[PDB]
């Protein structure tokens, strides 16, 4: 009866495709034909943040848009004050292989993870001095690719074991395990309302999970390679996925289908990191060609190029106030980029 | 104001302490070499980690790291065994390693093609084009014990062994049959044909047949690492 289930799966997939085709009344490029072009946007490196030894794999901005946490492959988590390019804390890490870092929205805890399979949560505002490992979360049978804090107590971590998870820091145990991805879950982003989160995997898919319920609401397909960068629209009703097919794609939750594909013939490298500006008009995508590209989101025009990194730009993040964009590369450098009037 | 001035002075003092610690860490980091152990499950890579963990000290959760001191030169070996069989995404964490020790079973003849395909994949990665591979053809004793005993001729797989002669260079061990040499160097020549028929001038493959003597293996790793360091110094000096 396996053949019967396969036939039923094919029929349901065809039905969903037909529903999507019915819902595709027009193409986003048609509605955004009348938009005045964003113009050539040229932001400069306001501050270069040096001090890391090995490559920088992931960075996260704090809610105050001033402190940023950076993970390096040498085993270092540095909390930089972007305004004065001064390092506040330099946490040594047990396992040097770090691929994710998170700043708690409360600005108290810093998360890290990687090839050690463990999400290490570090308390910064301790009763005493120094920075110590507040908690270590184990239970993921794969490399931790992205970890994000919901509150000061709950953290969602996506791992290479084709699984995302929700952890209670105090309990130290998984509360809800999100399964259904076939490939390794690489990037994970939360909605502005921390109710749903969309996770991109290596199976050329993204999935919209409900945090409390624990079920995969929708699955978005369309990429031809690994979705290795995810980022919610500031509205919360769309997201952007960067893949190794050298394409970014704007998927939409309500229509449950792609809206538009940002790609160019010149670029053949995969996209490393994807971030939406505060207004959602700009998609800053990091590429393997040692530079970032700023696309228009509503149109598909390449608004700008953030050249200035020697190696691939591994991490990219816009601040909550949108005033700056930090791009960290494999050359042990993060650069803050800001636009000049 | 005064309070702001005191806060900025404190921030600069913390930054200075962090910079001192980072300078010390940089000294240690440049004093240690990164070795990534890759190979099949039948290959004895874990045996290698244990062999040099209890020979010069070592650290001792997924990654089985170890750190030792061979003639004052620090080495940081590590094996990633806690992950899944998909490796296109975490292998990228090892682009700056000094070397990749690829341990090959070299005694089963069934997974040898799988080993060659893995070697090709490692050799051709954009993130591993600049990384030299120290190839450790392990299980030489078993290779011999099967080659003399007959039973399963190697010619069944890899048909080119029918039209293969022992390389004129050669280096047979004191007591050894010519057939053992031919099989051994045929496997090594398959690996070197995979290595050389690709990017040159950025990374090299160092072949070594693993023996029961541990000191020879550690010496080969040390010598290969020294060659890699000298070659990367040549490249950074623009004399290559």
């Amino acid at each position: 009866e396996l053949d019967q289930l396969r036939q039923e799966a094919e029929q349901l997939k065809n039905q969903i495709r037909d529903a999507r085709k019915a819902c595709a009344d027009a193409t986003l490029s048609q509605i955004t034909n009348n938009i005045d072009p964003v113009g050539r946007i040229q932001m400069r490196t306001r501050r270069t943040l040096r001090g890391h030894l090995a490559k920088i794999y992931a960075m996260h901005w704090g809610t105050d848009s001033r402190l940023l946490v950076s993970a390096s492959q040498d085993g270092k988590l540095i909390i930089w004050d972007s305004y004065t390019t001064n390092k506040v804390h330099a946490i040594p890490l047990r396992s040097s292989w770090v691929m994710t870092c998170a700043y708690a929205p409360s600005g108290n805890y810093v998360a890290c993870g990687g090839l050690d399979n463990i999400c290490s949560i570090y308390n910064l505002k301790t009763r005493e001095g120094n920075v110590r490992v507040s908690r270590e979360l184990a239970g993921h049978t794969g490399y931790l690719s992205c970890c994000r804090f919901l509150d000061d107590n709950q953290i969602v971590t996506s791992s290479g074991d084709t699984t995302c998870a929700l952890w209670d820091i105090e309990t130290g145990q998984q509360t809800t395990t999100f399964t259904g991805h076939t490939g390794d879950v690489m990037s994970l982003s939360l909605a502005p309302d921390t109710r749903l989160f969309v996770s991109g995997a290596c199976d050329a898919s993204a999935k919209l999970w409900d945090v409390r319920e624990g079920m995969c609401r929708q699955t978005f397909t369309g990429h031809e390679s690994d979705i290795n960068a995810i980022c919610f629209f500031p509205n919360g009703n769309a997201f952007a996925t960067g893949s190794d097919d050298a394409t970014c794609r704007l998927f939409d939750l309500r229509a449950d289908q792609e809206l538009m594909t940002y790609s160019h013939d010149n670029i053949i490298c995969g996209i490393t990191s994807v971030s939406f500006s505060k207004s959602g008009r700009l998609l800053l995508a990091g590429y393997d060609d040692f530079n970032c590209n700023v696309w228009d989101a509503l149109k598909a025009d390449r608004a700008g190029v953030l050249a200035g990194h020697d190696n691939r730009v591994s991490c990219l993040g816009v601040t909550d106030d949108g005033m700056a964009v930090a791009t960290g590369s494999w050359d042990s450098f993060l650069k803050i980029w800001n636009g000049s009037s | 104001t005064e309070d702001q001035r005191n806060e900025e002075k404190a921030q600069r003092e913390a930054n200075k302490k962090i910079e001192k610690q980072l300078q010390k860490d940089k000294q240690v980091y440049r004093a240690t070499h990164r070795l990534l152990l890759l190979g099949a499950d039948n290959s004895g890579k874990s045996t290698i980690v244990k062999q040099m963990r209890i020979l010069h000290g070592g650290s001792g959760s997924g990654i089985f790291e170890t750190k030792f001191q061979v003639d004052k030169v620090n080495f940081h070996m590590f094996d990633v065994g806690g992950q899944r069989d998909e490796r296109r995404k975490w292998i990228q964490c090892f682009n700056d390693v000094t070397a990749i020790i690829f341990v090959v079973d070299s005694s089963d003849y069934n997974r040898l093609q799988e080993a060659l395909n893995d070697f090709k994949s490692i050799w051709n990665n954009r993130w591993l084009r600049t990384i030299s591979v120290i190839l450790f053809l392990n299980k030489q004793d078993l290779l011999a014990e099967k080659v003399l005993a007959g039973k399963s001729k190697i010619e069944d797989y890899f048909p080119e062994f029918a039209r293969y002669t022992t390389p004129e260079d050669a280096t047979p061990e004191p007591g050894e049959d010519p057939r053992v040499t031919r099989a051994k160097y045929f496997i090594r020549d398959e690996f070197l044909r995979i290595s050389t028929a690709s990017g040159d001038g950025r990374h090299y493959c160092y072949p070594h047949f693993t023996c029961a003597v541990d000191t020879q293996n550690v010496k080969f790793v040390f010598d290969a690492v020294t060659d890699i360091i000298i070659k990367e110094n040549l490249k950074d000096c623009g004399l290559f």
Epitope: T162, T182, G183, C202, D203, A204, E224, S225, D226, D244, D245, A246, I268, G270 | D85, E86, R87, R88, I91, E114, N117, S121, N124, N125, R126, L128
Partner: nanobody
Framework: MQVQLQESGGGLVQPGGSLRLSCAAS????????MNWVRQAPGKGLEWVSD????????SYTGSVKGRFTISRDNAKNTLYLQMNSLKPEDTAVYYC?????????????????????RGQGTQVTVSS
């Protein structure tokens, strides 16, 4: 759309026969993806068999299929072909076509993995007499 690779062909064939396995791929630009053929023998793991590059210039095989089998890559029809000459009982296996991970690359790893996204369901080739 979804990455799909449907394989067709394969069946009971007497030893020494020939058979064409056709993998029709949809959902991606067939042109710029190195493509492999991987089989799985019963009671055994997945073994890479052949690979062909984007333009078709580079074709590589294993020892057991060095001269017997051939690989074709029709870009216009978005199809891959494995021609199977002088079949042997050692070839009784489930055959899959694998679009290896990244475009414009030949350094692709997870083609023989236990779980792999861009791999077809496959066709069962039995060479029972």
């Amino acid at each position: 759309m979804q990455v799909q690779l449907q394989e067709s062909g394969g069946g009971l064939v007497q030893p020494g026969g020939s058979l064409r396995l056709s993998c029709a791929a949809s959902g991606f630009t067939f042109s710029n993806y190195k493509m492999n053929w991987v089989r799985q023998a019963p009671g055994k793991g997945l073994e890479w068999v052949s690979d062909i590059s984007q333009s078709g210039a580079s074709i590589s095989y294993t020892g057991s299929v060095k001269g017997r089998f051939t690989i074709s890559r029709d870009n216009a029809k978005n199809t891959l072909y494995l021609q199977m000459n002088s079949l042997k009982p050692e070839d009784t296996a489930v055959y899959y076509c694998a679009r290896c991970p990244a475009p414009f690359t030949r350094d692709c790893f997870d083609v023989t993995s236990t779980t792999y996204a861009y791999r077809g369901q496959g066709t069962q080739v039995t060479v029972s007499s």
